[PDB]
Symmetry: C6
Subunit: 68 residues, 6 copies
């Protein structure tokens, strides 16, 4: 179901891992994951922007991450 996505985003959230989010148009967003629901992710930097998952290509952490 969400058995990979949730713990992945959640781990990045709890550990405040700096991430780069890449959009399908090729824009690179940067910050940390503040929050997420089944459709969006709140990306924190200057302010917290809301990113639609449907617009995301990849999420790439700035360092390796242990899934729980």
């Amino acid at each position: 179901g969400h058995s990979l996505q949730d713990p992945y985003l959640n781990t990045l959230r709890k550990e405040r891992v700096p991430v780069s989010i890449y959009l399908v148009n090729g824009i690179k967003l940067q910050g940390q994951i503040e929050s997420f629901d089944q459709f969006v992710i709140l990306l924190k930097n200057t302010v917290s922007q809301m990113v639609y998952k449907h617009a995301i290509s990849t999420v790439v952490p700035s360092r390796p991450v242990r899934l729980p």
Copy 2:
């Protein structure tokens, strides 16, 4: 489309009438205040309003920080 934190976040932006930038999947940038929204669309006000499809939005960026 409509879920656990997208709604409260968008509702907050509506209620506090915070100017936002809305970036579309094709890179175009819209600006305005969120008048209202449902599961699929968002009404964005300036001269006349405009109905923006959620499916075409990549990110919503508030002009100043905001509390969730």
Copy 3:
């Protein structure tokens, strides 16, 4: 909920609109009719427009909104 009556007002009141497509294309006309997935837009040429291909709908004048 919000989409349907908003389109309906534009339809019922014959309001000229610009429909911008996700690829940048700007279509113009008046909304003849619509359903859950498409919008039929007339004048110049008539055409059936998929909603999934639309980014925004911009009326040529302010609209009653509720």
Copy 4:
């Protein structure tokens, strides 16, 4: 679907030449042979199955009268 289906159906029955514009800007042409909930079968000069999700607009060569 109360608009889409009879619209395509009429185009289908009356063999109306149509131009189908893809979301990527490409124009397909021909007549509709059949369709279902997700695809459209387009015939003649080039015969081919089109996914609805890649379609932006269907522009018939002449307006259609709905039943």
Copy 5:
């Protein structure tokens, strides 16, 4: 309802097909199998193609629908 038999007929008759992606890339091969969301397109190796990425499917020779 029409997608299935069209793809099955192309499959069973080993018709070589051209699959155009929404980004404009053209893939070529034979349909090995398929399900609700993807198509397995056979050639050098078999690649998995997401339907959501496909714009058109064009057979190299005419298909007789059953």
Copy 6:
């Protein structure tokens, strides 16, 4: 859905080198670490999470069981 899963699982368990082509034309290379209904974790020098909706095609570097 009955076909995407076993295919990905095979690539995963045999740790087969793969290229993943995104809907925007970008090519990613690596190996499938894991996956669920919506995302694929792609391993390499830097691991990353890839939404299926952004993928056009998965292409293994060698032929695989089907």
